[PDB]
């Protein structure tokens, strides 16, 4: 059905129509690609000009730095603050905390950890919600996400779920939103949002409605 | 000594008892006859609720006395799950639930895949194939949720 | 041994064949689930377009008020508020069981010991809603042995709801249209509601969603309350 959709047709669609394409066809199969090609997704890109916004370049720490557009949080800081949280709040023997953290094959992907680091270190409280749980998301995904974000200049997106989503890329390859992955978006002076994936090469300008509706949105207050 | 036990539905049964029988043994006789466990029974005599450790003679119950039975249907058990965002989740469970089914219950409420959940209680990570009872998790216990990926 | 029965095989069974599986295998063990898996039980689910039917009352923390939730779920409205429920229960204990006002007060405030039965529910429905009811265990219905589905349909007749009480020691695994199993626990009330397509929807206040099942899926030892 979507195989006959052209890049030009998609470029002419509204944000909500483009988001319906993401939420319906952008998920990969188990051993096959999604139902949207690189060129079709390229139709969801707004401006193709070069921004003052950059990918700063463990996905959670990269998302914080990209959201703030600086090397705010080193990796050693991220790991030590995580340890403080785990031992104080989980009642673990601190030795067990050590087993959970250093198990490199079992690294953490927890939005509560990010929120506590953001408040403790940057005195930046946040709120979060899955996009699909936002009020009147069904009337318009773009409007509900805009209303939730308000005047904030950055957001962080987390894919807590079982699906892998292909997403627009401003370069040659597709950099999908993988399971448990964190990314960031940064707002510029013209009210355009730029998607910052630490595994990609360049920022890409997309409508807020392109974010998959099951993802969790983290927003500074 | 015969006594009678009457419900609000009109059903009446007859029991053979001694003045020395405990309320507890009277409920067990009712269970043997009707299949109703003692925790689902409330017995009333002379407007008073009877207690398990006393005897029929403690309440002056005599031959041909009538006791009132009103069943107590309040099944269910609840536990709490706390996340690192400060959110507390309430779950409906059974003592025999596996940790696996508890993670499915969290998925139904929050959308979090089970393979991304780690549950902690009494400072320890819980394994999927053991039950709440195995871990001595009682009603209104609190577990901690932490998210991790393969 | 049911371990080799597939979801697809179970879906191809008739209502009575599926109900025989419930009455033979759905009871949980003391510290383990029943002999039917979530996927096997999912084979008993009919439609999943549950949009005209709702769980009006979910179970609140700490409260043995399933008798009230079952009424509201059966009638699909906030028919009985919490205070109306507690007040009418108190009247019954004082007017019919002769309990004093001080003891009625302790019965109402003692949340951990509170609980009522099908006789109390029948009295509430008659006094407040002028709705008389009848009740029977499913296994006591006539010719239940020739067909459980037909016997339950015949007893229910033209009614659009039924209330189910699981009196006994057993916990029954039941079909669920979501990720987890929501069993029918011991000493509990649930309801079922009939829609305009003649489909029945199972409503547990301790569950997540309505689920469309055959009447023959209700465990045969449960007591059925039916409006006249």
From TrEMBL, chain A:
Protein name per its UniProtKB record: Uncharacterized protein
Organism: Parachlamydia sp
Full-sequence portion shown in this chain: 97 to 324 of 324
From TrEMBL, chain C:
Protein name: Uncharacterized protein
Region of the whole protein represented: 97 to 324 of 324
């Amino acid at each position: 059905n979507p195989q006959w959709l052209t890049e030009e047709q998609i470029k002419k669609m509204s944000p909500d129509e483009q988001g319906n394409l993401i939420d319906t066809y952008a998920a990969r199969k188990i051993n096959a690609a999604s139902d949207l090609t690189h060129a079709q997704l390229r139709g969801m890109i707004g401006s193709t000009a070069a921004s003052h916004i950059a990918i700063v370049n463990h996905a959670g720490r990269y998302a914080i730095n990209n959201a703030l557009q600086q090397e705010a949080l080193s990796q050693n800081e991220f790991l030590s603050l995580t340890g403080q949280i785990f031992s104080n709040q989980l009642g673990m023997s601190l030795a067990d905390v050590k087993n959970l953290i250093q198990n490199q094959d079992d690294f953490g992907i927890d939005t509560g950890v990010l929120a506590q680091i953001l408040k403790q270190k940057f005195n930046q409280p946040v709120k979060e919600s899955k996009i699909c749980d936002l009020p009147d998301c069904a009337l318009s995904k773009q409007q509900a996400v805009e209303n939730y974000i308000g005047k904030a200049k950055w957001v962080i997106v987390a894919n807590i779920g079982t699906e892998v989503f292909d997403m627009p890329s401003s370069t040659h390859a597709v950099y999908p939103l993988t399971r448990g992955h964190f990314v960031a978006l940064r707002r510029d002076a013209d009210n355009r949002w730029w998607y910052l994936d630490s595994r990609g090469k360049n920022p890409v300008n997309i409508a807020l409605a392109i974010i998959p509706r099951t993802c969790t949105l983290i927003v500074p207050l | 000594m015969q006594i009678f036990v009457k419900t609000l539905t009109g059903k009446t049964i007859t029991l053979e008892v001694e003045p020395s029988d405990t309320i507890e043994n009277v409920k067990a006789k009712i269970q043997d006859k009707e299949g109703i466990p003692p925790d689902q029974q409330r017995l009333i005599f002379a407007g008073k609720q009877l207690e398990d450790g006393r005897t029929l003679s403690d309440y002056n119950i005599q031959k041909e006395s009538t006791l009132h039975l009103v069943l107590r249907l309040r099944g269910g058990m609840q536990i709490f799950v706390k996340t690192l965002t400060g959110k507390t989740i309430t779950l409906e469970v059974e003592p025999s639930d596996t940790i696996e089914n508890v993670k499915a219950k969290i998925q139904d409420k929050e959308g979090i895949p089970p393979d991304q959940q780690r549950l902690i209680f009494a400072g320890k990570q819980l394994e999927d194939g053991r039950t709440l009872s195995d871990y001595n998790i009682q009603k209104e216990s609190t577990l901690h949720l932490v998210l991790r990926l393969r």
